[PDB]
Amino acid sequence: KVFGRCELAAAMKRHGLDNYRGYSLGNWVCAAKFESNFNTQATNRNTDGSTDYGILQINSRWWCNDGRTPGSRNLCNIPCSALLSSDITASVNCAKKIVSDGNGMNAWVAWRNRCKGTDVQAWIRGCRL
Numbered sequence: 820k821v822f823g824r825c826e827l828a829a830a831m832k833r834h835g836l837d838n839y840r841g842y843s844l845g846n847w848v849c850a851a852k853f854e855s856n857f858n859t860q861a862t863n864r865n866t867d868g869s870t871d872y873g874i875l876q877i878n879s880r881w882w883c884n885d886g887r888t889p890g891s892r893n894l895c896n897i898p899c900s901a902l903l904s905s906d907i908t909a910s911v912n913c914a915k916k917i918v919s920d921g922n923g924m925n926a927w928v929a930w931r932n933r934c935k936g937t938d939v940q941a942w943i944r945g946c947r948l
């Protein structure tokens with residue numbers, strides 16, 4: 820599913836991401852836009868053989884099992900395919916684990932290079948929340 824900007828903001832807010840660990844909703848919507856262009860089915864292979872899955876491009880090296888990433892961890896205890904669902908619950912719950920890892924949202928390269936330090940509030944502007 821390809822989410823609308825405000826539709827995704829509403830979904831994330833309902834799942835408790837707004838201000839989660841101090842990150843305002845705008846940060847999550849901005850990260851999703853640049854990581855997957857709001858597409859839940861987005862996948863991207865990395866040089867190390869791992870793959871990123873879903874709306875928030877969660878990596879198979881540490882967070883989910885895709886059966887083809889040797890010596891990897893499944894910290895979120897979920898098949899990576901579950902992160903491609905139209906229902907973002909799995910992605911949100913796993914993201915909460917990741918952001919509490921100690922490095923915050925810096926774990927998402929796109930957020931660090933394209934959202935961090937910007938007016939992220941603009942991403943939820945005009946939305947009925």
Ligand SMILES: [Cl-]
Nearest residue numbers: 840922923924
């Ligand atoms: Cl933090």
Ligand code: NA
Nearest residue numbers: 879883891892
């Ligand atoms: Na894994």
